[PDB]
């Protein structure tokens, strides 16, 4: 009928453990990274950044 477990010396320890699990359930459907396609990258959209021109005659 005790609501606490004693130690090897006689020290009381509140360990009713009435409930099975004792933890805060994390929220589901968390915000996952957005990336449905490869075009998502701003770099892919940006024009050629190589500037490989050939000025001359």
Curated annotation (Swiss-Prot):
Record's keyword terms, sorted: Isopeptide bond, Nucleus, Phosphoprotein, Ribonucleoprotein, Ribosome biogenesis, rRNA processing, Ubl conjugation
Function statement: Non-catalytic component of the H/ACA small nucleolar ribonucleoprotein (H/ACA snoRNP), which catalyzes pseudouridylation of rRNA and is required for ribosome biogenesis. This involves the isomerization of uridine such that the ribose is subsequently attached to C5, instead of the normal N1. Pseudouridine ('psi') residues may serve to stabilize the conformation of rRNAs. The H/ACA snoRNP complex also mediates pseudouridylation of other types of RNAs. The H/ACA snoRNP complex mediates pseudouridylation at position 93 in U2 snRNA. Essential for growth.
Crosslink (Glycyl lysine isopeptide (Lys-Gly) (interchain with G-Cter in ubiquitin)) position: 27
One record GO biological process: rRNA pseudouridine synthesis
Subcellular location: Nucleus, Nucleolus
List of residues that carry Phosphoserine: 35
Molecular function GO terms recorded: RNA binding; snoRNA binding; telomerase RNA binding
GO annotation, cellular component aspect: box H/ACA snoRNP complex; nucleolus; sno(s)RNA-containing ribonucleoprotein complex
Organism for this UniProt entry: Saccharomyces cerevisiae (strain ATCC 204508 / S288c) (Baker's yeast)
InterPro entries: H/ACA_rnp_Nop10, H/ACA_rnp_Nop10_sf
Coiled-coil regions listed: none
Major place of residence: nucleus
Domain of life: Eukaryota
PANTHER family (alphabetical): H_ACA RIBONUCLEOPROTEIN COMPLEX SUBUNIT 3 (PTHR13305:SF0), RIBOSOME BIOGENESIS PROTEIN NOP10 (PTHR13305)
UniProt cross-references to SUPFAM superfamilies, sorted A to Z: Nop10-like SnoRNP
Family: Belongs to the NOP10 family.
Protein name, UniProt field: H/ACA ribonucleoprotein complex subunit NOP10
Complex and partners: Component of the small nucleolar ribonucleoprotein particles containing H/ACA-type snoRNAs (H/ACA snoRNPs). The protein component of the H/ACA snoRNP contains CBF5, GAR1, NHP2 and NOP10. The complex contains a stable core composed of CBF5 and NOP10, to which GAR1 and NHP2 subsequently bind.
Pfam families in the record: Nop10p
């Amino acid at each position: 009928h005790l609501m606490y477990t004693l130690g090897p010396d006689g020290k009381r320890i509140y360990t009713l453990k009435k409930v099975t699990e004792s933890g805060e359930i994390t929220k589901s459907a968390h915000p996952a990274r957005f990336s449905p396609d490869d075009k998502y990258s701003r770099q892919r959209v940006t024009l050629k950044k190589r500037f490989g021109l050939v000025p001359g005659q």
